Structures are given as C-alpha cells and as structure tokens.
Amino acid sequence: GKLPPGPTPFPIIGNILQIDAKDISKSLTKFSECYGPVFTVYLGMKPTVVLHGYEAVKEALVDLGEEFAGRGSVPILEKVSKGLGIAFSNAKTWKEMRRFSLMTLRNFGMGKRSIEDRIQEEARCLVEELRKTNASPCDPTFILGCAPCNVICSVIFHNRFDYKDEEFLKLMESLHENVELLGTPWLQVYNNFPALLDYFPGIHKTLLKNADYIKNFIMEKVKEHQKLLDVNNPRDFIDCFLIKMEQENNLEFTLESLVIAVSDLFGAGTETTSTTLRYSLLLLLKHPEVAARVQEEIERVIGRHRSPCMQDRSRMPYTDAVIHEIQRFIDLLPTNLPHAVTRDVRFRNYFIPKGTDIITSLTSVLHDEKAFPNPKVFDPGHFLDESGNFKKSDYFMPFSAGKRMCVGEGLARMELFLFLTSILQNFKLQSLVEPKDLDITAVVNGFVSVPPSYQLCFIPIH
Numbered sequence: 001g002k003l004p005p006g007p008t009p010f011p012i013i014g015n016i017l018q019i020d021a022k023d024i025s026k027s028l029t030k031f032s033e034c035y036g037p038v039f040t041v042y043l044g045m046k047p048t049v050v051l052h053g054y055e056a057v058k059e060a061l062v063d064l065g066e067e068f069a070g071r072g073s074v075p076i077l078e079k080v081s082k083g084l085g086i087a088f089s090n091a092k093t094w095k096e097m098r099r100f101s102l103m104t105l106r107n108f109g110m111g112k113r114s115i116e117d118r119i120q121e122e123a124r125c126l127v128e129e130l131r132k133t134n135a136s137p138c139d140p141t142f143i144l145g146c147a148p149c150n151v152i153c154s155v156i157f158h159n160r161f162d163y164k165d166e167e168f169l170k171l172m173e174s175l176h177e178n179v180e181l182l183g184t185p186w187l188q189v190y191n192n193f194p195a196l197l198d199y200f201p202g203i204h205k206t207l208l209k210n211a212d213y214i215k216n217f218i219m220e221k222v223k224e225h226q227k228l229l230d231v232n233n234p235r236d237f238i239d240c241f242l243i244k245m246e247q248e249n250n251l252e253f254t255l256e257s258l259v260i261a262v263s264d265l266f267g268a269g270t271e272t273t274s275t276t277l278r279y280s281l282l283l284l285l286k287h288p289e290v291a292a293r294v295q296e297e298i299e300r301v302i303g304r305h306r307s308p309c310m311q312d313r314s315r316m317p318y319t320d321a322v323i324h325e326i327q328r329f330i331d332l333l334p335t336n337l338p339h340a341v342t343r344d345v346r347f348r349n350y351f352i353p354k355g356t357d358i359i360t361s362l363t364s365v366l367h368d369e370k371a372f373p374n375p376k377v378f379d380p381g382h383f384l385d386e387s388g389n390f391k392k393s394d395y396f397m398p399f400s401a402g403k404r405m406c407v408g409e410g411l412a413r414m415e416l417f418l419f420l421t422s423i424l425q426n427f428k429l430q431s432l433v434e435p436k437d438l439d440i441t442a443v444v445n446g447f448v449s450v451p452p453s454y455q456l457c458f459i460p461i462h
C-alpha cells in the first residue's frame, strides 16, 4: 500500500504552485533533495510518481520495464493518434507498431539503399545549401530543420524535397506550429482542466488543421506508393507497411494506422534532431577548441576528399565523445516523455496502482555529478579515457531506456555524426560575438530544451 511521499498538494490544483513554470526539472530536483529518489507530485488531482537519480530511473525503466512500459498522459496529441501509432499508443497496438518500426528502421531494413546512404545524400544537400549562404551571417534554424525532416521523408517516402519546396516547408511549418502549440513539460495538464481549453482554444484549434495537413501530406504519398508497390522489393517504410497489410492477419495495420505511425516518427524525429544539431553548432561556437579538435580528427581519419561514413565513427573517438557530450549536456528532454504503469506494482517499499503517471528525470541521470564530474560543464573528456579512447557510460541516457526507449535512436545518432562531420569538414564556424558573450543556456519550450537564438557564418574550407 501507500504512494511515495511528496509535497503537500493544495486542493484541486495540486503541487502546481510549487513547480517552477520555466524549469520543471529544477523543481523536481529540489523536491528530491527532501523527499528522496522516489516521490509523488500532483499535476491537478491525479498523482504522478517521479523517479530521480540513475538507480530509481534504471530500476523502473529497465528492471521493471514491462510495469513501466505504459505511455502516460499526453492530452490532445494522444487523442489525434486515436490510441494508434507508436508514441502515444499502449498495449498490443503499441507492441505491434513498435516491433514493426524497429524492424523496418534498421540501417538496411528497407532494401539496398541503406538509411546511412539516405543520410549521406542529405548531408551533401545540407553542405550545398550552407554554401549558398555565401559565408554571410545566418540563423541555421531553418536549414538544420530541413535536413532531419528530409531524412525521415527519405526513409518513409523514398523521396527528399528541395529546401525551397512549398509543401515541404509547409510540412515543416505544419509540424513546427503543431509541436509549438502543443508544447508543455507537464503534458498531464490537458487531461485535467477543461475550462482552460476554452480560455485558450488557440493552442488546441489549428492542430486539427495542420496535424491534418501532416496526415494529409502523408496519406497522399501512401496512395502513390500503392500503385508502385513491389512486394519483393520494399524501398521505404510505407512499402514495408503496405506489404504487411497485403499478406497480413494484422488488424492493427490499416491506412489510418500507417498515417498516424508516420506522423509520430516525423513528430518525434524532426524537432529533436533539428534542435540537437542547432545546439551542436552553438556549443562548437562556444568552445572553438572542440570544433578544431574534431576537424583535426576528420582530416586525419576521413580526409578532405570523401564524404564521412558510419565506419569512420569507431575510428573517431574524440568526435564520438563530442556528440555524446552535446546530447548529455543539452539534456533535450529533461523529463523524458511521460510514462505510466501498466499494472499495480510494488516499487521498492511503495505501492503504485495501475495507470499511475510516471515522470523520469533524465536530467538527474545525464547530469549525475559522480558519473560526469562537473556535469554542468561541457567537456568531451566526460567520454574519453586517459589514452584518448572513447569511454561509454551507463548514465548516457538521452534516448531514455527500457521498453519505450527512442525508436529512432540509431537513425538520430547517424544523422548527428554524418551532418556534424560533413559540416566541420567543409566549413569553419564564425560567430558574430566572442565565445565569452555567447549565451548557451537552454530555455525549455514545450518538452524540449532549446538553445538561445544565434547567428553565424559558414566559412568554406578550401
């Protein structure tokens, strides 16, 4: 019996007034200092168990993986998914979509053209459009959003779009707008106070219009794929899904579920990778010696006359340590994505009833002071041994862990490695201000820690 301890909840509104509206993780870490690694908080009337620290997070997500494999409250967004898709689905529907997606999203899961090849083509397109900035000051937000989005287009539709393509920009504008409107760390909130929906219908209204533009953009391509389907040679996510439908026995596979599953991948993989890439460049501007050392490794291992490839990563410990350090340092999703227990569970000396929402503090793992000495300081050394070789850490958990762990983790890491090295191989980064005046403090917008706005010049290396 009994839920974990926690701050005394004021009637109806819960612990809201005790949580920093700008930085919930910071609040969760303060609560943990006086309630321990496992505590409860109220985002309204319903209790939410918070897991803080590597041991608690790992014990639940990994050791008790099935119990914590549920997708917690994610209002509106969960509703547009209609219990289908991957991110907000649960039980059998989730299991089948996730299994299908993992098998399909392998490097060579969709024919002879690997996911790596697709990312390499995009890395070249990214370098080309950066050349078009002609070494003038520019905000990289747009182009850095296009590349990741195009990578997903390539793996889903087997097609990429020009960075000036109307529908594509629209897709990104529809994706962006939708994630912005439906942005908040709590998330559990829209499943609580209905009066707020009417006070601020703006956030909830355009979603049907744009999330439908997304669903419509996708459905349109699906129809095109059905006419060109080759059962012996599927070349993208859609074909593989269409084949799974043709033969089948699976009622979980419909054109409706395909559209939603594709919406999820786009939603989960576009903004995260884009933000990480944008934050990467900022950190390189902030610590130019890091950028210089990565370039030294690029020249020595890859050289100047060929595109970087995944095989290069194992031979580039410094660059790998830098990519790991960027993800750990930026802590993209401070509180992960909301989980929920799939059944009554006795976690340690506490009892957690089925359906209870769970929040895991990834910030507490990624910034553990013992696993990463001086955790608030950017230092690739956190992933380097005394001999300059790459050093793994069980605390490197930016993609989460367990049964719900990021489905596109492999794809994301390839994108970071190939885009960053292709960028540093072809350009020197020049900031308008000195590193000492460069703001690198993140501001959590929705679920994501985004870097402050900045501009830079991409000076071609020749």
Ligand code: HEM
Pocket: 071, 086, 087, 088, 098, 152, 264, 265, 266, 268, 269, 270, 272, 273, 276, 332, 333, 336, 337, 338, 339, 398, 399, 400, 401, 403, 404, 405, 406, 407, 408, 409, 411, 412
């Ligand atoms: C730097 C980029 C990325 C980061 C940091 C990231 C991080 C994460 C995290 C922390 C979660 C939540 C895990 C949980 O519930 O415990 C997640 C979920 C997910 N991610 Fe990513 N992600 C990134 C890129 C990608 C990409 C490129 C794709 C798409 C191909 C994608 C697809 C997914 C999906 C489908 C889920 C939901 C999985 C499920 O509920 O079973 N992610 N991601």
Ligand SMILES: O=C(O)Cc1ccccc1Nc1c(Cl)cccc1Cl
Pocket: 077, 087, 179, 182, 263, 264, 267, 268, 271, 272, 333, 337, 447
């Ligand atoms: O699913 C979407 O349409 C995007 C979306 C909206 C709200 C909350 C989460 C997500 N996707 C998502 C996922 Cl699945 C993991 C990490 C980060 C993000 Cl933004």
